[PDB]
Amino acid sequence: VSFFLVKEKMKGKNKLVPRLLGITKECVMRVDEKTKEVIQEWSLTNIKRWAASPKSFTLDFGDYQDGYYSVQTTEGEQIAQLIAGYIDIILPLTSAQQALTGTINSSMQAVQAAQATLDDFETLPPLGQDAASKAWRKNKMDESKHEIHSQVDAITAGTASVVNLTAGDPAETDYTAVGCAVTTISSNLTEMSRGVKLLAALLEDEGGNGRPLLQAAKGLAGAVSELLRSAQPASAEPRQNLLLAAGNVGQASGELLQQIGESDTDPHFQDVLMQLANAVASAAAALVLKAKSVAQRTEDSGLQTQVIAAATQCALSTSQLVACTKVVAPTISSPVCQEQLVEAGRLVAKAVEGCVSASQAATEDGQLLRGVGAAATAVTQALNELLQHVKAHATGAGPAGRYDQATDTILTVTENIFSSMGDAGEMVRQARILAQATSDLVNAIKADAEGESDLENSRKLLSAAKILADATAKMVEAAKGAAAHPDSEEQQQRLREAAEGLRMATNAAAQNAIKKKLVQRLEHAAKQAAASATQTIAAAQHAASAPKASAGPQPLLVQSCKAVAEQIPLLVQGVRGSQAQPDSPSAQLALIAASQSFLQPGGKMVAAAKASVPTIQDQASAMQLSQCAKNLGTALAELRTAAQKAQEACGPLEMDSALSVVQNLEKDLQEIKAAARDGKLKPLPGETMEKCTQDLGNSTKAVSSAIAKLLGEIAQGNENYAGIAARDVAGGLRSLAQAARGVAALTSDPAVQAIVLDTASDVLDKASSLIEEAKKASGHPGDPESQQRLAQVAKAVTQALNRCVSCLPGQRDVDNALRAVGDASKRLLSDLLPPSTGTFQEAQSRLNEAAAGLNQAATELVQASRGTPQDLARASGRFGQDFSTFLEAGVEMAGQAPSQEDRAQVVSNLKGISMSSSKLLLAAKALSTDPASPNLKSQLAAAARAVTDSINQLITMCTQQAPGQKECDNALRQLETVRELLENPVQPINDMSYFGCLDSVMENSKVLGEAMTGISQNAKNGNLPEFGDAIATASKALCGFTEAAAQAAYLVGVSDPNSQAGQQGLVEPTQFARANQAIQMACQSLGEPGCTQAQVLSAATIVAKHTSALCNSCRLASARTANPTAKRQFVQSAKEVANSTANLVKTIKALDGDFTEENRAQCRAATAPLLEAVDNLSAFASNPEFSSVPAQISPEGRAAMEPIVISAKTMLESAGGLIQTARALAVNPRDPPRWSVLAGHSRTVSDSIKKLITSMRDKAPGQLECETAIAALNSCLRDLDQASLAAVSQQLAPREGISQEALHTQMLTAVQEISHLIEPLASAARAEASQLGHKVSQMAQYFEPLTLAAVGAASKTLSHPQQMALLDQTKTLAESALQLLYTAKEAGGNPKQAAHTQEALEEAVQMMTEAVEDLTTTLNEAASAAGVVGGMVDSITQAINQLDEGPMGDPEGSFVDYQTTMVRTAKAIAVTVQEMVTKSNTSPEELGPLANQLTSDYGRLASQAKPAAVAAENEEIGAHIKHRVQELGHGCSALVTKAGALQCSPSDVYTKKELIECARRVSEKVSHVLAALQAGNRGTQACITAASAVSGIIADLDTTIMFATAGTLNREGAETFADHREGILKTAKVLVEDTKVLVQNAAGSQEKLAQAAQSSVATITRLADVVKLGAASLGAEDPETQVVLINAVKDVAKALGDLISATKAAAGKVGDDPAVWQLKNSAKVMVTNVTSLLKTVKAV
């Protein structure tokens, strides 16, 4: 056996292990390298494919097992030769051109279809003439105009893209990007045509002429079709024909943009851009002439052709530049048009340097100087054009302004002072710059004032200049203060306030120049975000409906698209409203709010689109969506920054704006009532009665929640968040007014619409009073009467809200039952009736029949909930009448009660029934407005359960019937209501998992078997009480079983593939209802006079338990919510419930042992604040944004649901028969037929449990999906095996129509989507069997894409080691995914799974995370080798986005640790930026690796910033940290763009200057990040600085020692180590003083701790210098004598470093904690090293 020590790769691991591969004459065999034991055998006759490589040997036998043997050795050839000999012993377009041709044909059909539709006419909806209908027309016209502008942008960007992409040879052209461009054009043409038809219909309405707009759109469509014709690969026309078609497309698009009014750039810019492009072209013509002369002179034929080719390429590139300028000139504001211009310009430049080099190949001084001059002109004009439309990029739209440069400088420098808070040096530097600039502005103002003839204008100018000068003086004194005290936080705060005062007094000297600039930048960013969202929606709707088979998460993309589509019009309305009223604060605040609300749906859509991209079969549509998602991510990041800056500028004006919105709405309702008296009021499009009613209900709930939140913010005395609360009130009232107008327009009888409109006007009146009172109270904090009056006005608003909701016609029947319940309760319960009629047992029978009727009525109401609204109203009325009958019988039985406490208990239980029935009718009232709501229906079923529970309790307590007979009745009244849970189980009724439900089914079956045996045995024996409790336990087990089986069916439905789950909501309602009802009943018990002390104790226990449950619910809600203001209000609600229940418990403790009536009255007074706190918390939690999202269960999901429901219903009906026969046997102990019937009922019951459990066990959700995913991954691994076997044999054929960076981006997107899924799949494998199948299918869908892209990329790669690296790392990721799949199919979501499955799951998760890391690293470094910086910008923008789009839960960490880590990361970022600056000059091919390192470092910093933001002491400090990190990300993405640009074009002079300026901005932003980190702790930061300084000192000492050991000149005159000793000793004394002051100042003022740290570092530096001087005094003749002393000082330095670390960890720590003790230990060690220094100094 010949053994080769080979290395084989572990599965799931990018790791090699030594293996011994042995070849016998008859077999090949694998042997361990340590144990030398055989691991596996393969017959030699078996193997059929062997392939050798210089670095590998690969063997494939195949038929024995799937998978081949690849083992990595350097002798792969010798081992292969053995194998080969022994086996002898044993025995015309291209395809990418065709793909683009098909894409162009489909797009041409789409273009023709769009043309044909423009002849058709849009029918406009029936529209009224009232203000809302006019506003609908105008908003729809604006939406159409915006969308047409965005789609024309996309068409011209795609046309320029086609021109740029087709510029090359028929080979090395990426036809997939050409197809993406043409699909972009055609998709946006379809969308544009639809929008133009709508806009033109709207134009023909109001009396305009839509026909010119139709003709312009038709001309654009015709030019587009001519372009698509010219772009066909089969075409043989000259390039100038495509260039002409593209320029015509640009012209026609400009004409169309003229017709709608969305031509944005002024025609002066258009003419300048044309003349600049033609200047470039003429300069290039001169260059071509010079190169022609050079080619004439040159002799060699080969070189002459190179000169000619260079000149022709220059001519071609400039012709395409003028063509692309024609294309993108109408739409040059678009970033993608600008990107296509810079691509054209770089092609022009590259051709220019090509011409220069081909000239340089010839030798003559005059001619080469001619060529260099001409080439230099060509690049000068190219820069002129490029910078001109870079100026175009910035909005800069409007008048120049009299003071423009000064105010722009002031804006910049004041923002710089704001961003460097916590850094005195940069703050005062920027403050000095600002003082100079503002003094220039003041001088300009005074000069203008002297110039002005008018006395008033000169007076106002001089007064403004004087106020501005006062502000500069104050800011200068603030700068002096911050310069005197570099570590004082107060000085830096006062400098910030002075800079803010300057920014505020510039807004008065100028015409709000800074605030206007910030609002204009917000408008620009918002328009870009809306356009990107529009283009992404077009791309998504194209890829979704494309004839490609869908293999991915497209439905979630559809939901995200519709959400963003309902968001876009509001953003567009905010932008247009801010431009319409430039000087209106309300317009600016509305734009800020619109953009901030746009942020979250847009992020969801970007994520959904990125998750959809890998699964789209068509590569063109997947690329269009990938490009559009990236653009929208960038737009969203820029919108976040712009809205932040605008909000900081625009100030706290939201409280007055809310009132303005409210009276605007009230005036609008007056206009609507006028139009209702007229005929103008008509339904607005899409407004149905059901939709408007649901809108009215949701709006009422939202207003109540916002009022609760407003009162909370007023209580906290936080004026900022009270403004947001009043804004939410105003928005909810806007929605309510809209829904009220819709309902009034839809109804026809004038009285009803009049009632609706007066109810809405009353709500708005009450809310105006509320907001006025809120303003008055937030103006003056700490006024108790103010809070009381606020509560009064808030409850008045809530009453008006309820009157508005109930005024609907369909509410009155449920309201009739509510009034019947309330009035019957008030009359019959608050007073007993001493008169009584009939015998006691007659009253018992009457009450029993009334209770039976009441329970059956509740069941009928629950069934009606699934029926028509008329059915629900009729059922509610019948239930109310049956409640009246029941309460009459109950008060009769209470009257005939013999004992006083007996009738007292009857009254209490009747009060409980009244409350439960009121809440049942309130659940019905909730349904009546939103009948199709699943959650409200489940709420009604739960309320029926509560009602029957109250009835059962009263009958059990107060009947004294024959033993065992109450138990059967209560059991059947339980069964009747619990049977309704099985009807439509499309909502969760517990929080159980699948296996929780299966366990509970088994446990309840066990308990019910015990109870069934009990009832049979004690019916035979005749022992009644045991029979009764056995019946009770049987019914209880049946109710629990029904709950478990109902959620079992629900989860089997949700688990289905096409099904979709729903968000659980912040507070679970059924648990919340039980808590509130219990607290209310207990407070009633405390309230009543006749309560014994035992009842008081029990009720105190009840309130304590339930209020604790509420506070825990509030904590979970705070952790779960993404809204910061909702999180604040949930914390406040928890705190106030805690305080109220604590005061209640205190007054209860006072009550215990006293019993006096006065203390009872005090307890009654104390129980009320708890009730009102619970009421405010219910009102706040009622916000529909906190509500649970319904699950969408597919029809096959309900098919899966049905068996469980059928079995459970059969069980429950048979159990009802069982209770009947058991009751009959309880009457008489034995009967021949009844016992047989009992046996039949029991057998049907048990058989039903067994078959239901069989179905549950066999279903096992997640196991079929896991098996499908395992088969899919095995197929992918076989594909990767075939690829690798082809690549070893040099048989891997490359892909010809697609680039490397495209296939690598495909791989990266698939890998990123797999990575996003690794963790949730494991979380489902632990707990949820319902989410597990979803996760595994979602994750298995990304591996066929990844395998295809990986095989293509490996085929493209030429270096065989690197292609094998890609193939092997993709194998590793696939194998680790299979390990997850096997382990998660074993775990299954079952919590009872053994520890071996848990450890295997954790290990597989870690393995596959490492495989993702490895493949991501490979792809990133492959992109960095080339100049490809896409993905780096995408990564940076993703980091910027994720830094905000995350819920806040305050996970634990110390801000000191985060500060140290992020300070290190930021300093690394800075040194990388400076490396990039130097390498730009030195080696420009190292900018891509450095850009990758910057991208990794920024990603680390940004991921660290969210924990440090939650962990920081202030929300303000964390806000600044995150905002600085996001600004730094903006800078970093710009810098990596310029870095890739310079790497690809290293000789370009202007890209290099742009890179240098980008690096300058990035370094300043790094400084701002560091200042944000320092602002968290001035003293802890000083410890990090001290650590770095002492580390540098230690390094210097090491340098001096390694000098002194071998070679050093220690001679300074006659100075020796005699006079040095006294100085060294005094310095060491200063050091011991310094370590003492560090120990004291560890816990104290941060300025004191910082000063101590700085003084210690200064002392150590002085000691190091003086010790070096002493060592040099010793002389070089004795090295050891010097080295011992320098090692002594080095030990002192190390001890100080450890002491600084101890102080940092001990800063802000109490005495008892270990941190302070560890400080004194290292402090003592510090002294011992100092004394060791002191004695050594004396000794020598």
From Swiss-Prot:
Name of the protein this chain belongs to: Talin-1
Modified residues (N6-acetyllysine): 1149, 1636, 1720
Effect annotated for changing residue 472 to V: Reduces stability and binding to VCL with little effect on binding to APBB1IP
Positions of region (Helical bundle R7A): 963-1058
Role played: High molecular weight cytoskeletal protein concentrated at regions of cell-matrix and cell-cell contacts. Involved in connections of major cytoskeletal structures to the plasma membrane. With KANK1 co-organize the assembly of cortical microtubule stabilizing complexes (CMSCs) positioned to control microtubule-actin crosstalk at focal adhesions (FAs) rims.
Shown stretch of the complete protein: 310 to 2135 of 2541
MF-aspect GO terms: actin filament binding; integrin binding; LIM domain binding; phosphatidylinositol binding; phosphatidylserine binding; structural constituent of cytoskeleton; vinculin binding
Region of interest: Helical bundle R3: 392-516
Subcellular location: Cell projection, Ruffle membrane; Cytoplasm, Cytoskeleton; Cell surface; Cell junction, Focal adhesion
Key words of the record: Acetylation, Cell junction, Cell membrane, Cell projection, Cytoplasm, Cytoskeleton, Membrane, Phosphoprotein
Helical bundle R10 as annotated region, ranges: 1428-1578
Residues found modified as Phosphothreonine: 747, 868, 1460
GO cellular component: adherens junction; cell surface; cytoskeleton; cytosol; focal adhesion; ruffle; ruffle membrane
Region feature Helical bundle R7B, mapped onto this chain: 1186-1258
Assembly and oligomerization: Part of a complex composed of THSD1, PTK2/FAK1, TLN1 and VCL. Interacts with THSD1; this promotes interaction with PTK2/FAK1 and VCL. Interacts with NRAP and LAYN. Interacts with SYNM. Interacts with ITGB1; the interaction is prevented by competitive binding of ITGB1BP1. Binds with high affinity to VCL and with low affinity to integrins. Interacts with APBB1IP; this inhibits VCL binding. Interacts with PTK2/FAK1. Interacts with PIP5K1C. Interacts with F-actin. Interacts with SVEP1.
Signal peptide segment: none
Phosphotyrosine PTM positions: 721
Its membrane topology: Peripheral membrane protein
